[PDB]
């Protein structure tokens, strides 16, 4: 029975010291997972491609391939704002989801268009009311002009994954292409890689997280 005590003390002490060394965290509490443990605590203690020339050349080649195919036909045109930077969506701090730049981008450059379904104002009011009804409570509406709004709650681009921040690094302008107004997002100041794309909502609580910041999105 010597083995019991000997290997017990040796392995136990070594393993707890190894865990202590591997534990750069605060040694949070927790039992096993056969105990019905939900631990639904509010605050979590754990964490939380080539060039532009290649892209434009490939895009023009694809578009001229379409135009060469067009001799058989309309139903094939493309959203002209294809000059968009590479981004991605992942878990964020300011909110659950967010948009991170995949490559370092300069300043005063187009990033992405905010696209969705076009609706009038009363339709937008009805829709936001119904969304507040079903517990959505997360407005994705955008104001093109006085009598037209974009709605990206169910249909739209990844531009619906850009959070409001008290200090933005991207702004939103309203271009008119083909005679119609569209919402583009420009890089206000230079943006490094793997940086979250901040942007000011101007809505007229705030999980801002900025150094200088105000407690309201409004």
């Amino acid at each position: 029975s010597r083995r019991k005590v000997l290997e017990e003390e040796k392995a136990s002490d070594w393993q707890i010291e190894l865990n202590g060394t591997l534990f750069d965290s605060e040694l949070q509490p927790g039992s096993s997972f056969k105990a019905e443990g939900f631990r639904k605590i509010a605050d979590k203690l754990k964490i939380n491609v080539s060039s532009s020339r290649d892209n434009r050349a490939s895009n023009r080649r694809f578009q001229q391939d379409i135009e060469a195919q067009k001799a058989a036909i309309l139903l094939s045109l493309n959203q002209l704002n294809k000059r968009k930077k590479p981004v991605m969506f992942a878990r964020s701090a300011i909110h659950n989801w967010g948009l991170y730049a995949l490559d370092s981008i300069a300043a005063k450059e187009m990033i992405i268009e905010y696209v969705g379904e076009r609706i009038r104002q009363p339709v937008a009011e009805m829709r936001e009311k119904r969304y507040l009804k079903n517990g959505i409570g997360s407005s994705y509406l955008f104001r093109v002009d006085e009598n037209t709004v974009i709605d990206a709650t169910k249909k739209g681009g990844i531009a619906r994954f850009i959070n409001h921040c008290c200090d933005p690094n991207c702004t939103a302008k309203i271009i008119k292409v083909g005679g119609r107004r569209r919402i583009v997002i420009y890089a206000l100041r230079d943006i490094a890689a793997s940086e979250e794309l901040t942007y000011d909502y101007k809505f007229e609580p705030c999980l801002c997280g900025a150094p200088n910041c105000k407690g309201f999105l409004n």
């Binding site: 290997e7 392995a11 865990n19 927790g30 997972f33 517990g135």
Partner: protein, 308 residues
Amino acid sequence: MFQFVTPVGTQNGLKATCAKISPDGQFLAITQGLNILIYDIRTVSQTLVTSHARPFSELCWSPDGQCIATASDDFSVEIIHLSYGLLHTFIGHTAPVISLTFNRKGNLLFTSSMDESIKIWDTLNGSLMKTISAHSEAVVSVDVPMNDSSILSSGSYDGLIRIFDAETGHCLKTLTYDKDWKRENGVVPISQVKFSENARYLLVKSLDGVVKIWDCIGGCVVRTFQVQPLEKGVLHHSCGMDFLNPEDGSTPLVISGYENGDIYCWNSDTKSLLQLLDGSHSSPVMSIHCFGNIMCSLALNGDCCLWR
């Protein structure tokens, strides 16, 4: 109907978490706090000592019956060779890891944590491969199919049943809504998920005793099994469920063990209940693991049994 054989399990000691048959229908790997019992089938037992610092939640065999992985709340996961001792220590998580599984080839291992994420580890080189953070809740179960090895389902304590890929780890389809896209009090945590034998339909159990079969191509439920009284449907632990495709079986069966020592059998095609077992009533059945025509059941105690 399925007859009983023998309750060989050792009901003495700490509580056991699960017991998964070997992929050749020959061994039974049972767990106790910081140790592994191995029962032959033959009537004999062997023991393996681990290198954890806490009791571990789940263990699963290897498709060649030569290794055993274990998921300990010390935030690490240990793969131990059944004959040459411990082999690899995956130490990248930052939260108690819950479930584990690897693919048909034993080429990559899948780990679910409380970090609100999943991790794809490389078994042979012991290094990490990928990380999939697609939950704001407790990721309690991951499972790759056996005939396929390209997709993996993921269930959490918020109802989100996601499907990802083993090759690149992107989100392919989500069959349910989280708190933000449904009435908040409509949520129901997912306990245990399981693929069909052909990876075309998804078996799932929630924390209200319901057992659903989703058509993952259409994303719609097609079959729902339930106990018409709601006594133990409402549950609190990972009350085991599993599938039983009998050798030359007409239609495979679904098996579940509620917070009693009860075990049910439903014909998936007809939903008509066929048989139930109890105790053979003493404690919540913590796990069930089936095989070609056999089944091992383990209650919250050391209570262990098998059938045929």
